Each structure stands twice: as structure tokens, then as C-alpha cells.
Amino acid sequence: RKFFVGGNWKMNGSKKENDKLIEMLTHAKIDPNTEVLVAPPALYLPSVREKLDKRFHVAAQNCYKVPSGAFTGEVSPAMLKDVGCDWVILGHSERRHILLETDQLVGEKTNHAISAGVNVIACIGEKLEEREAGKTEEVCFRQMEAIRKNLSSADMWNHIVIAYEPVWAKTATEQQAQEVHLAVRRWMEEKVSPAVAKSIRIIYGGSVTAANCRTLAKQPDVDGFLVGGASLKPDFIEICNANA
Amino acid sequence: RKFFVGGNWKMNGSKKENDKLIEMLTHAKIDPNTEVLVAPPALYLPSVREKLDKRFHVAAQNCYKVPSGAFTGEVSPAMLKDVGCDWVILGHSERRHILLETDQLVGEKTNHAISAGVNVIACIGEKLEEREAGKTEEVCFRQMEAIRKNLSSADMWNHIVIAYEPVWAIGTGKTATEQQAQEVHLAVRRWMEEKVSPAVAKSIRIIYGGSVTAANCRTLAKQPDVDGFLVGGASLKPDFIEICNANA
Ligand SMILES: [Mg+2]
Ligand SMILES: [Mg+2]
């Protein structure tokens, strides 16, 4: 499985700061076997995609579940493709828990994006009370099932990267991350197919820093990262190189 | 009060379709005393603003309530200003009722946008079951109060346009008459007079955000407390220009 590192800029960006990050990525020494993605705020997606070499993916941080219509404030996968973007992050913990997105909506968006030619980083993860009640697997499997049930065909998994976010984190160890990634992969093996489970990337979306990335990368079922704050700093390059 | 017409493109657009609308706006003949605004999807705000004559306002269809942070998928007013856009639509009925935005959240966003130098079209309106229970004013006043209460000072009303959406009509087979529209606009202006000030009530634009068409716009525009429109589907068509000219 090809190592996959996505930098989620979250609600951070400006012409000035984006220029700095683009120059950092353009001149950086990055392991050629790492797939690298960045996700700027929607306003800046067309410009970042125009300015970055195709070696880098550029992802939206959200999209909706139909190509057009009366949905003020929403953007569709067709618009992403229009501006050269072929990736989207869906179901991020902030969208589920702050902006109130349901499991079903994330699954509907995922199916629609892939149908429109956009690959999906599909995010899952449990909150603190859920982990403490022993429901990590119950919650993660429920979120995964809502995606599985909404896909139009089993080949769509070739266009998904699963991101596990330990929302509950209190600090998640590399052992705790590996434990969930393994459980999710075994779920994929049973509910989809061994072939998909073996090939699908499951990336870790907890706190990823220059200091902990190499230990996390060595876990056998951790295939990369969905990076938060470090994506805005030169440490992102070290994280991109965590598997090398 | 200066007549104000905003076109809400909703989730419709592409680089090439937007260029087509920009050409329509550029070649349109419009009364220079009318304020005209368009609101493209967020991906297209910088390109639309760069390409479209500065005589037209360019608005975001939504934004969030702090300048930056851990809010994946949200954009801030500071980013709007960074790409030259100084307007936003907030509290649109689709965001309230489909995306579940609260009265308080709309008020917090409105305050934050204005704080950043972004003017706000603040949308209000009641649903049918609320209207049939005699709660049109109760609902509209509750929504307005949540905005008022969250403003950092009453001077922020100089940066607000209120849009009344008759959700009870938009979302059903009913049509709101121009008399029904005028009746709500009058009550909202009187709320402004009583709860804010007469000076603010006299100057604030209250635009109608129901079904606005080439066929009904002139009758709606002549209503004394209707100061313009927030246009939906017709904003994507040449009919938008007739609506921009509805008061002349
Ligand atoms: Mg021309
Ligand atoms: Mg109707």
C-alpha cells in the first residue's frame, strides 16, 4: 500500500500564507513513494491547484451530495472537478460533531463524489465517552456501514482512503491507533472483501507531529496521515517523509 | 433608501457558466442608483470578483464566525476580504432548515462578518405551520432579536440588509401576494423602529426573498417597505436584469 500523507489546512489560508506553503512544497525533498495531498479552504482551491505541480493532490474539505441545486453555501463534486481538484475530505470530526453531519449524509456524499470522479478521504472516529464505554468499534463500524450501504458498487472502494480520528484524544499511543486501524481493516475484510481490505489505505488522523510520525508510520495497519496543524509548518515535510 | 437586488446563485456554477453570467451583467443596462450583488459558490468567489466589474458586489453564500481555526470545510470573513469580496449572505432558509443553522449562530456570524468589514444580507422568515398559528411576527422577531443581541454595537446595522423569505410559500404550493409581503416588511421595519431606533428603521433596506420573477417584480418593488430582492433561480437567467430594473 502506497504511503499517503494529506495535510488538512482546516480554516486557515490567505494569499500570503498559501504562497509560503506552496513554495515550501515546491522545493521540498519528499520521498517519491509518498502520495502527498493538501486541502486548502474552498476559496483558495482553484489557485492552489493551479500553482502546485501535479505531483501533489489538492482536496476540498467538504462537498455536497448532488451536482447542483438550491443548497445555498454548498459546493458539488462537479465544481471540484471543474477547478482541477480530484479529492475531497468527508465526514471530518469537525463536520460531524460541530457542524452536525449525520453518518447517512457522509455516506451519501461519499457515493456521489466518487460517481462524479472525485476520490474521498472518509473520516471516522469515536468521542471520549464512547471510548470510555468500550464502544470504539461499535461507533467506527456504524460510521463505516453508513458509507458501505450508500456506495453504488463495490469497486468504489478503490477511490476511498479511510482516516481514523481519535476524537477522544488524554493522548493516543501508536499502539492505540494500530488497534483501531486493524479492527477497521478486519471489518473491511468481512464486509467488503479481503482484496479491498488488503489494498485500502487507512491513515491516522490524530495528532501527527514531526516527533511522533516515524513511530506511527511503523505500525503495520497505519498507511499514512491526515495531518492537522503541522500541515501549516515546515514539519509537514518531515511527516511526508515518515515512512522513508 | 437605495434599491438593492442580490442574485443568489446557490449551488450552481462553473468557471465557464460564471463567465456567461458575468457577460450578462457586464452588458446589462441597469439604473446606476441600484445596488446589484451576485453570490457565487465559494470556489468561484476570487475569480468572479477579479473578472466582474466592481460596480457589482460579489457575496459569499455563507461564512463562519471566527477568522481561522479548526473548522474543516468552513471559510472566514477574513478570507473573503483577502480575495476582495465584501458581502455575505447569512441565515438563508436553506442553511437554517437543511443545514440546521440556529438563530444564535446566524447572529454570531453576522457580527463577525461585519467586524471584518464584510456587509451582510441577513435572512429571516417563518414556515407555514408557524404562519398558520399566527406566529409570523413571533418567529421573525425572534430571528431579528438573535441578530440584534449579538451585534457588537448598533452601528453595525449600517452594514446589514435584511431579507425576508416567506418560507411558508417558498417551500409549498402557496404564493405570497405583494400585500402579504408588504405586511411582513412593515412589521419588521416597525420592530427595527421600536427595538433599535427610528433612524435605523428609516434607513435599513428590507429586501424580499420570496419567488421573484420578471412577471411579478414590478408589483413587488412598488410596495413601500420592499427595498429590493434576494433573487433565487432567476439570477441564473437574463430575467435577472429585468428584476434589477424593477423599480424604474
Ligand atoms: Mg462581452
Ligand atoms: Mg410556493
Numbering used by the authors:
A (entry chain A): 5 to 173, 178 to 252
B (entry chain B): 5 to 252
What is the paper's account of this structure, in its own sentences?
The amino acid residues except for residues 175–179 in OvTIM showed clear electron density. Two homodimers in the asymmetric unit were identical with an r.m.s. deviation Cα of 0.22 Å. The loops in which catalytic residues are located form dimerization interface with the dimerization loop of another protomer, indicating that OvTIM shares a common mechanism with triose phosphate isomerization based on the dimer formation. The catalytic triad (K14, H96, and E169) is in the upper entrance of the β-barrel, while the SAD motif is on the surface opposite the catalytic site and exposed to the outside of the protein, as expected. The side chains of the SAD motif that protrude into the solvent region are not well-defined, while surrounding hydrophobic residues such as L155, M160, and W161 are directed towards the core of the protein to take part in the hydrophobic interaction. Additionally, the N115 in α5 is another characteristic feature of OvTIM. The side chain of N115 forms hydrogen bonds with the main chain and side chain of S156, stabilizing the loop located between α7 and γ2. The residues forming the hydrophobic core surrounded by α7, γ2, and α9 are also substituted with bulky amino acids such as M148, R152, and M196 in OvTIM. This substitution in OvTIM resulted in tilting of the end part of α7 toward the solvent region by ~2.2 Å because of steric hindrance of the substituted bulky side chain and N115 compared to that of the corresponding region of Homo sapiens TIM (HsTIM). Therefore, formation of short 310-helix γ2 caused by the SAD motif, the stabilizing function of N115, and tilting of α7 cause unique local alterations in the surface structure in OvTIM, distinguishing it from vertebrate TIMs. Interestingly, the cluster of hydrophobic residues in OvTIM results in formation of a long hydrophobic patch.
Triosephosphate isomerase (TIM, EC 5.3.1.1) is a key enzyme in glycolysis and catalyzes the reversible isomerization between dihydroxyacetone phosphate (DHAP) and glyceraldehyde 3-phosphate (GAP). The overall structure of OvTIM is similar to that of other known TIMs in that it contains 12 α-helices, three 310-helices, and eight parallel β-sheets, forming a classical α/β barrel fold. In OvTIM, a specific SAD motif (S157–D159) is located between α7 and β6, inducing the formation of a subsequent 310-helix γ2 (D159–I164), although the corresponding region is not conserved in either vertebrate TIMs.
